[PDB]
């Protein structure tokens, strides 16, 4: 993502192509064809990226919430607990991750 | 008048009320209650305020100027960094000790020639701050005689080049040029980085003015920074050096707006609603 | 070192809001002690490869000024909070409640009364009464203090070097700082 790094990154092979990309392409018609016997693919390394823009926002905000209960209420057979559960401006959740 | 040498002497030797030596006009217009604003501002004071003022005006108090005098000269070496701002009461001692030994009508009329010329003195460093010419030309000029006149190929790319050579140390008086061994060198500004080569650069160009890989990255940090003072027709079209200066006013000329759509790009997309790390290096991938 | 040199990368202070001071890019080398040239020579067309984009990423980005790393950046060059004025609907009348109560009306809870057609609505500048000045944020600290290429390095007379790369120094002073 940065301008500076992108020289020496695709050069080493940080971020840049696949070997699918940057390699001639007899090569990897080579290696397509003697994969089964003779195979050249750990030669090579792959640039796996991860995305910088519209992903994960850099405001502030919690992963984990907690929230106390609104009303609870203690029967001598069962306990209930009720919950506000807020979902802020521009969130989103998946109840799996919830949990008592 | 900030930087005036005998007006800030004024404002540390001379007072800053109005006293019947200094400032006797001023002073006999309200004794006399001829002044424009608050005339009867001169009644209404005590005998102790108000006899004290017509005993001082009409006979005045003597004064030395030499502690004046001499201050003026203190506060023009501390300012044309002839002296250190920690030795400014050190040569003050010091020269109001010189002119105690050596008191004369003669000094004190050689104190007031000295004061006016260094008034002169400080106001010339001033202007040729501004104008910033004089220590470039004497060492440019003092280059280009290493350089020979006569190149055997593209003698017309190269009289206009070291002609625009002069242009840049002419207009920018931040600029300049010296030597440090046998090199000469060009900084673009003062305590700034973009410092060329000129004894490598013109030992790289010469050779390649009638050309139609091979230069040194401070031979193109000298054709980037000579490139805004070159015209289409001072160089070739088809000469490789001329190809690079047409080449490098159309950089700097994107450049220039390219700044002007990084200002805008990043604008919106603030008031778009984007992430602040993503909106900085989308746009740059976009203008790059 | 001088034709193709290292950038100087600027070091941010984040309680300041300035620069602390450039070091070269020493951590971010490349190593071909054992290249030959054949690829020596590819690494040295990265190295200036990537001081092209620096000097063409400067020349967009960083504002012009002359000294490099200031103490105090104007308010007309500091990325100030602009947001839109506050809409406020007040919610009573204030001089028809006065009317309701002397007439012997307890009023309680809370258009919204039903003894008032009338309704206030104030907007207020959100803004600050003065322009901040003085440091930059981080993402202005991104913008501007691009690495610096510095070609030729240190070849000037004393006092044309870029002595505002050292972290000790004051521009103001034209010394370098000590322990007390």
Redesign the interface.
Request: hydrophobic letters at 40%.
């Given at each position: 993502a940065t301008?500076?790094?992108?020289?020496?990154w695709s050069?080493?092979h940080i971020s840049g192509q696949d070997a699918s990309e940057y390699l001639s392409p007899g090569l990897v018609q080579f290696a397509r064809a003697t994969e089964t016997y003779f195979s050249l693919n750990n030669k090579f390394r792959n640039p796996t990226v991860a995305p910088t823009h519209d992903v994960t926002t850099d405001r502030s905000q919690r992963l984990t919430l907690r929230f106390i209960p609104v009303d609870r209420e203690d029967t001598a057979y069962s306990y209930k607990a009720r919950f506000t559960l807020a979902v802020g401006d521009n969130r989103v959740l998946d109840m799996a991750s919830t949990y008592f | 008048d900030a930087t005036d040498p005998a007006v800030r002497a004024a404002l540390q030797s001379q007072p800053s009320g109005l006293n019947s030596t200094d400032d006797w006009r001023q002073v006999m217009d309200r004794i006399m209650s001829l002044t424009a604003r608050n005339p009867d501002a001169f009644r209404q004071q005590p005998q102790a305020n108000r006899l004290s003022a017509i005993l001082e005006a009409v006979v005045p108090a003597r004064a030395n100027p030499t502690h004046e005098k001499v201050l003026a000269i203190v506060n023009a070496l501390a300012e044309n960094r002839a002296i250190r701002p920690d030795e400014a009461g050190l040569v003050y001692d010091a020269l109001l000790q010189r002119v105690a030994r050596y008191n004369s009508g003669n000094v004190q009329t050689n104190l007031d020639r000295l004061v006016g010329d260094v008034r002169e003195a400080v106001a010339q460093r001033e202007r040729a701050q501004q104008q910033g010419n004089l220590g470039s030309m004497v060492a440019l000029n003092a280059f280009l005689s290493t350089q020979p006149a006569n190149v055997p190929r593209g003698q017309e790319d190269y009289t206009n080049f070291v002609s625009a050579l002069r242009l840049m140390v002419t207009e920018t008086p931040?600029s300049?040029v010296?030597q440090?061994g046998p090199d000469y060198?060009f900084?673009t500004?003062?305590?700034?980085?973009?410092?060329?080569?000129l004894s490598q650069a013109f030992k790289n160009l010469q050779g390649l003015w009638g050309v139609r890989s091979l230069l040194?990255?401070?031979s193109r940090?000298l054709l980037?920074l000579i490139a805004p003072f070159t015209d289409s027709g001072s160089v070739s079209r088809d000469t490789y050096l001329g190809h690079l200066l047409t080449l490098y006013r159309e950089?700097?000329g994107q450049?220039?707006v390219?700044?002007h759509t990084?200002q805008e790009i990043t604008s919106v997309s603030r008031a778009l609603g984007q992430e602040?790390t993503g909106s900085?290096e989308a746009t740059?991938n976009y203008?790059? | 070192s001088?034709?193709?040199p290292t950038?100087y990368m600027w070091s941010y202070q984040p309680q300041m809001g300035l620069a602390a001071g450039a070091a070269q890019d020493y951590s971010?080398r490349?190593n071909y002690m054992s290249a030959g040239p054949h690829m020596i020579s590819?690494?040295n067309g990265?190295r200036?490869?990537?001081?092209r984009?620096?000097?063409?990423?400067a020349?967009?980005?960083t504002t012009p000024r002359?000294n490099?790393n200031p103490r105090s950046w104007p308010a007309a060059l500091v990325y100030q909070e602009s947001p839109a004025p506050t809409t406020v609907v007040l919610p009573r009348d204030a001089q028809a409640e006065v009317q309701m109560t002397n007439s012997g009306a307890q009023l309680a809870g809370g258009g919204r009364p039903s003894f008032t057609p009338r309704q206030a609505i104030l907007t207020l500048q959100t803004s600050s009464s003065e322009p901040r000045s003085g440091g930059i944020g981080t993402?202005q600290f991104?913008?501007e203090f691009v690495?610096?290429?510095?070609?030729?390095?240190f070849?000037?007379?004393p006092?044309?070097?870029?002595?505002?790369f050292i972290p000790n120094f004051d521009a103001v002073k034209d010394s370098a700082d000590g322990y007390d």
């Open positions: 301008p500076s790094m992108m020289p020496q050069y080493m | 931040q300049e010296y440090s060198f900084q500004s003062r305590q700034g980085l973009q410092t060329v080569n040194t990255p401070n940090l980037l950089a700097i450049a220039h390219d700044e990084f602040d900085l740059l203008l790059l | 001088k034709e193709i950038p971010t490349i590819r690494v990265i200036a490869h990537r001081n984009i620096l000097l063409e990423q020349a967009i980005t002359n490099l993402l991104i913008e690495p610096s290429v510095y070609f030729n390095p070849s000037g007379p006092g044309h070097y870029p002595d505002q």
